[PDB]
Amino acid sequence: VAQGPNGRALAESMNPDLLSAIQQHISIERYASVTYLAMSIWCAERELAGFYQFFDGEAKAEQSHAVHFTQYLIARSQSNDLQTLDAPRQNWDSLASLMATAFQMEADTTSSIQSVYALAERNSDTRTTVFLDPLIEAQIQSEDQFAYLLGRVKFANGDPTALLVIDNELRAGQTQRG
Amino acid sequence: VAQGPNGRALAESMNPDLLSAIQQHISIERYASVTYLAMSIWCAERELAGFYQFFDGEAKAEQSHAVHFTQYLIARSQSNDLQTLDAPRQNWDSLASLMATAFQMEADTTSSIQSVYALAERNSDTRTTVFLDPLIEAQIQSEDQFAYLLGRVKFANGDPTALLVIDNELRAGQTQRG
Amino acid sequence: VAQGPNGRALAESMNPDLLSAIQQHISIERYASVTYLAMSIWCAERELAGFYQFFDGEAKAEQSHAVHFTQYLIARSQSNDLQTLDAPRQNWDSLASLMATAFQMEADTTSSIQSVYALAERNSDTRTTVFLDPLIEAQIQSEDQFAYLLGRVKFANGDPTALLVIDNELRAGQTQRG
Amino acid sequence: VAQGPNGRALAESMNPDLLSAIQQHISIERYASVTYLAMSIWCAERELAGFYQFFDGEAKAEQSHAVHFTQYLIARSQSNDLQTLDAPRQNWDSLASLMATAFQMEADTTSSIQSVYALAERNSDTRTTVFLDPLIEAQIQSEDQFAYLLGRVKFANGDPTALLVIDNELRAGQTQRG
Ligand SMILES: [Cl-]
Ligand SMILES: [Cl-]
Ligand SMILES: [Cl-]
Ligand SMILES: [Cl-]
Ligand SMILES: [Fe+3]
Ligand SMILES: [Fe+3]
Ligand SMILES: [Fe+3]
Ligand SMILES: [Fe+3]
Ligand SMILES: [Fe+3]
Ligand SMILES: [Fe+3]
Ligand SMILES: [Fe+3]
Ligand SMILES: [Fe+3]
Ligand SMILES: [Fe+3]
Ligand SMILES: [Fe+3]
């Protein structure tokens, strides 16, 4: 029985480029988390309490996703390397602009996963593609959700009354098409 | 005991023009179903989740109506003839325009039933008029309902804020005058 | 943020050949639905009430599968294109012949999914392969189920007594090997 | 306020031909009742206990239908005239032959109602057509049911094993397509 780079018994070695890509993706998830925290603060500063609660929960969810990836590296007997985290964007001219950044952040999180997926396929790492499959599934739902929230906010066309209505939807937990 | 055209024991023969009219009406119900599916998709594409849920349910209801008619032909020992189904309309310039097509589709479904009803009366087919009576009753309620939804959407006069409010009514199941 | 062909925010563009293949597959699911409806009617005409109830439920299930695909296109910000639907087959010389068509229809539904799957792999569309994976899993179970029903009906070898016994199994919901 | 022929206050006079037709129809219902009793006895004599229980219940149901008609005449302030009742048929060569007589009896009961219906329409007696409407509805279901039982017995093709299976279905209350 061989020992992996993190010291645990090694079921199968992992290509170092794939390892680096997973460690980098963990940073992407952590950065999405602090970005959603920053968005929750922006909404709270404008009394958009429902949007604030939504993004506060998304920040915690994205952090959980990052930890889920750290656990996979542990399971593969690979080292984690928690990286410096950039400061998030913190200023937006409108809720519609913020929601566009949020949608792009969600799509970019999926692109990061897709990049890791392709590397695993090139290295025939079927454990990693299996691990990623349900995360891509979740990303489809999150992209559908964020397209819904962005599209609904854009439909409001900057009308405060419509934005108050949507804010109350989010406070109630009405955050998807259903 | 005679055998009917579908092979079962025949309680009373049915005029072939009336049979053809019922088979055609089943197509009308099936076409209303796929039309409501198309309308549900149009609403989902615009984040009108309550309208989407409403029309998704109406599509399933109209299909059930079609099956209800197929069961009547079985009960009368008559052959079913499931027909080619046209593609539905799929593009509208506004929710108000979509709701006008929906109302017209409901009224046209009733006109189809009325045409079958008149043919049954000309042929003294009292089983068929009795079968249709409760379906006409249901159509009165559906026409009242769709006039309500169309009228409420028109009252909104294209204001996104009012349409968001109505959308949430539909999501909650508030779809009739009550 | 770019807008997709259906107007929603676009997480990632989809190759038009893959889009066409998904729209065509939706037609396959809708056609399986109306085929199972036709089979349910054939069984009802012969007093095979358990087979009638089984195929009535399968028709509703296949329609749900089609709608599930329409929702995926919405989630990917792609246009739906609901197509003309052919009339189903409606005549069979025996229950065994009907069950053979049913098995073939289920296998052909899987082949359609497999064709879409291969196109997604050629286009590196990992969202689509992830979306399809559980549907292939369900198809394995449905193929196993339909091979079971077909094989059991063939074992009966046209004996009405055995077919009545199997009919009652289906009425009770005994439709798989278990 | 005028008094009707049975002595009660008269809401609206009834044409004597229509009255005679209703009194005759009551005899038809009573005759269906004793016919089903005779059929229940025939089945009991052959140990077909499920068929016996079914027809015993149908005999009681048909009697209830007759009483329902006597109550309508009371409600219309018309005289009842309970008539001599013929002896039922009591001999059949096979269960299939018995079931054919049963189906014909059910269809003939509907024809009797239809004859009364047409007379009421000629006399513009809307109370009577309204009274008869739900009874025709029930007849559609009974005709569907008896076509089901007859067709299933014919499918058995005289095989005692299949007839025992069907007998047990009836004992369990499985008497319709469902
Ligand atoms: Cl805004
Ligand atoms: Cl509008
Ligand atoms: Cl067979
Ligand atoms: Cl027999
Ligand atoms: Fe994440
Ligand atoms: Fe995310
Ligand atoms: Fe309908
Ligand atoms: Fe309708
Ligand atoms: Fe009525
Ligand atoms: Fe399917
Ligand atoms: Fe299938
Ligand atoms: Fe999977
Ligand atoms: Fe009766
Ligand atoms: Fe009867």
Ligand nearest to the CA of B107: 8
Cβ neighbors of D54 (< 8 A, separation 6 or more) are D40, D149, D170, D175
Interface contact C49-D159, CB threshold 8 A: no
The span from the CA of B33 to the CA of C146, in Å, is 28
The residue assigned the tokens 């048909």 is: D62
Closest among D171, D175, D162, D147 to D53, alpha carbons compared = D171
CA distances from C156 to B3, C95, C149 (A): 27, 10, 11
The span from the CA of B35 to the CA of C29, in Å, is 17
CB B73 within 8 A of CB B4: no
Q: What DSSP line would sit under D17-59, residue for residue?
A: HHHHHHHHHHHHHHHHHHHHHHHHHHHHHTT-HHHHHHHHHHH
Chain D nearest-CA distance from C160, in A, is 6
The upper half-sphere exposure of residue C9, i.e. CA atoms within 13 Å in the direction of its Cβ, equals 29
Residue C52 forms contact with D (CB below 8 Å): yes
Residue A103 forms contact with B (CB below 8 Å): no
Query: Does A12 appear as a known binding residue?
Result: no
The span from the CA of A35 to the CA of A43, in Å, is 12
Cβ neighbors of A116 (< 8 A, separation 6 or more) are A18, A21, A22, A25, A128, A132
Q: CA-nearest residue of chain A to C7?
A: A151
Query: Does B65 appear as a known binding residue?
Result: yes
Query: Does A65 appear as a known binding residue?
Result: yes
Residue B1 forms contact with D (CB below 8 Å): yes
Closest among A25, A26, A24, A61 to A40, alpha carbons compared = A61
Classified as helix, coil or strand, B6 is coil
Q: CA-nearest residue of chain D to C172?
A: D174
The span from the CA of A22 to the CA of B164, in Å, is 41
Phi-psi region for residue A124, left (φ > 0), alpha (ψ -120 to 50) or beta? left
**Residues at Cβ < 5 Å from ligand 9 ion:** B 133; D 133
**Count of H-run helices and E-run strands, chain C:** 5, 0
- Which pair of structure tokens corresponds to residue C3? 């807008």
Closest among D176, D156, D177, D173 to D53, alpha carbons compared = D173
Query: Does C133 appear as a known binding residue?
Result: yes
Cβ neighbors of A38 (< 8 A, separation 6 or more) are A88, A89, A90
Q: Is the dihedral of CA C66, C72, C77, C78 positive or negative?
A: negative
Cβ neighbors of C67 (< 8 A, separation 6 or more) are B37, B56
Classified as helix, coil or strand, C63 is helix
Q: CA-nearest residue of chain D to C50?
A: D177
CB B90 within 8 A of CB B39: no
Question: Alpha-carbon Rg of chain A, whole angstroms?
Answer: 18
The span from the CA of C176 to the CA of C149, in Å, is 7
Specify the DSSP element, H or E, that contains D138. Answer: helix D126-156
**Number of residues that this document lists for chain A:** 178
Closest among A108, A125, A168 to A18, alpha carbons compared = A125
The span from the CA of D29 to the CA of D71, in Å, is 14
Q: What DSSP line would sit under C77-92, residue for residue?
A: T----PPPBPPPP---
Q: CA-nearest residue of chain D to C164?
A: D162
The span from the CA of C142 to the CA of C122, in Å, is 27
Burial of residue B157, with CB atoms counted within 10 A of its CB: 0-12 exposed, 13-18 middle, 19 or more buried: exposed
Classified as helix, coil or strand, B92 is coil
Residue C74 forms contact with B (CB below 8 Å): yes
The span from the CA of B123 to the CA of B113, in Å, is 15
Classified as helix, coil or strand, C174 is coil
Greatest Cα pair distance in chain A: 65
Experimental method: X-ray
Interface contact C75-A150, CB threshold 8 A: no
Residue C176 DSSP code:
S
Find chain B residues with C-beta within 8 A of A157's C-beta. 160
Instruction: Choose the mutation target among A143, A148, A176, A177 for the interface with C, i.e. most C CBs under 10 Å.
Output: A143
The span from the CA of C22 to the CA of A157, in Å, is 33
- Which pair of structure tokens corresponds to residue D150? 């007859």
Residue B88 DSSP code:
P
The residue assigned the tokens 């009339």 is: C87
* Neighbour count for residue B53 (Cβ, 10 Å): 21
The residue assigned the tokens 């999926």 is: A110
The span from the CA of A166 to the CA of A158, in Å, is 12
CA distances from D64 to B63, D69, D106 (A): 36, 9, 15
Q: What letter represents residue C148's amino acid?
A: Y
Interface contact A177-B46, CB threshold 8 A: no
CA dihedral D55, B78, D140, D169 (to 10 degrees): 30
Chain D nearest-CA distance from B110, in A, is 20
CA distances from A29 to A56, A75, A109, C85, C137 (A): 15, 19, 7, 45, 30
Residue C11 DSSP code:
S
Burial of residue D29, with CB atoms counted within 10 A of its CB: 0-12 exposed, 13-18 middle, 19 or more buried: buried
Of D156, D159, D178, nearest to C171 by CB-CB distance is D178
Find chain A residues with C-beta within 8 A of B164's C-beta. 152, 155-156, 162, 165-166
The span from the CA of B66 to the CA of B23, in Å, is 10
Phi-psi region for residue B77, left (φ > 0), alpha (ψ -120 to 50) or beta? left
Chain A nearest-CA distance from C15, in A, is 16
List, in sequence order, every residue forming a beta bridge with C3; answer none if it has no partner: C9
C-D contacts (CB, under 8 Å): 38
Residue C12 forms contact with A (CB below 8 Å): yes
Instruction: Choose the mutation target among A154, A157, A161 for the interface with B, i.e. most B CBs under 10 Å.
Output: A161
Residue D140 forms contact with B (CB below 8 Å): yes
The residue assigned the tokens 């539909």 is: B170
CB D127 within 8 A of CB D167: no
Find chain B residues with C-beta within 8 A of D151's C-beta. 8-9
The span from the CA of A39 to the CA of C42, in Å, is 59
CB B50 within 8 A of CB B167: yes
- Which pair of structure tokens corresponds to residue C117? 């799957």
The span from the CA of A136 to the CA of A42, in Å, is 28
CA dihedral B57, B63, B67, B72 (to 10 degrees): 90
Chains that touch A (3 or more CB pairs under 8 A): B, C
Find chain C residues with C-beta within 8 A of A114's C-beta. 124, 126
Three-class HEC string of chain A: CCECCCCCECCCCCCHHHHHHHHHHHHHHHHHHHHHHHHHHHHHHCCCHHHHHHHHHHHHHHHHHHHHHHHHHHHCCCCCCCCCCCCCCCCCCCHHHHHHHHHHHHHHHHHHHHHHHHHHHHCCCHHHHHHHHHHHHHHHHHHHHHHHHHHHHHHHCCCHHHHHHHHHHHHCCCCCCC
Interface contact C164-D166, CB threshold 8 A: yes
Find chain D residues with C-beta within 8 A of B131's C-beta. 137, 140
CB B74 within 8 A of CB B44: no
The upper half-sphere exposure of residue B46, i.e. CA atoms within 13 Å in the direction of its Cβ, equals 21
Interface contact D143-B74, CB threshold 8 A: no
Query: Does C45 appear as a known binding residue?
Result: no
Ligand nearest to the CA of B135: 7
Question: Alpha-carbon Rg of chain B, whole angstroms?
Answer: 18
Instruction: Report phi then psi at B115, rounded to 5.
Output: -65, -45
Instruction: Choose the mutation target among C8, C70, C72, C74 for the interface with A, i.e. most A CBs under 10 Å.
Output: C8
Closest among A14, A55, A16, A36 to A109, alpha carbons compared = A36
- Which pair of structure tokens corresponds to residue C20? 């066409």
Instruction: Choose the mutation target among A98, A132, A144, A155 for the interface with C, i.e. most C CBs under 10 Å.
Output: A144
